[PDB]
Structure 1
Amino acid sequence: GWDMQNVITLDTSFEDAKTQVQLKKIHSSVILLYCSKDEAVLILSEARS
């Protein structure tokens, strides 16, 4: 099936703006994350928030 719901590219300012709107449309599913460790920390903190 591979129902890839959406592709999100956080350019910058993960907590400032323009990224919360994209991250808020992700529903219960598997989230393939590609970034660096020091940046995956921020992305996962925002995702928990």
Structure 2
Amino acid sequence: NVITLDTSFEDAKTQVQLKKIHSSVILLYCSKDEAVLILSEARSLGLTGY
């Protein structure tokens, strides 16, 4: 199932949305500005593994 980001700068529901991602290939249909923040959050969550 596709997990979409409802509202930016939620800081509360973002972790709940990201908790459901358990895979090795992730598709990102976003823009540059919000994609930077999404990847920063993934780095904080350690989603940039091998």
Same fold (TM over 0.5): yes
The CA RMSD measured in Å over matched residues stands at 1.6
**Stretches of structure 1 lacking an aligned partner (at least 5 in a row):** 1-5
Aligned pairs, number: 44
User: If the length of structure 2 is used for normalisation, what is the TM-score?
Assistant: 0.71
Runs of 4+ in 1 over 2 A off after TM superposition: none
User: Higher relative CO (CA 8 A, sep ≥ 6), structure 1 or 2?
Assistant: 1
Judge which range, 12-21 or 39-48, deviates more.
Answer: 12-21
Larger radius of gyration: 1
**Stretches of structure 2 lacking an aligned partner (at least 5 in a row):** 45-50
User: If the length of structure 1 is used for normalisation, what is the TM-score?
Assistant: 0.72
Identity of aligned residues (%): 100
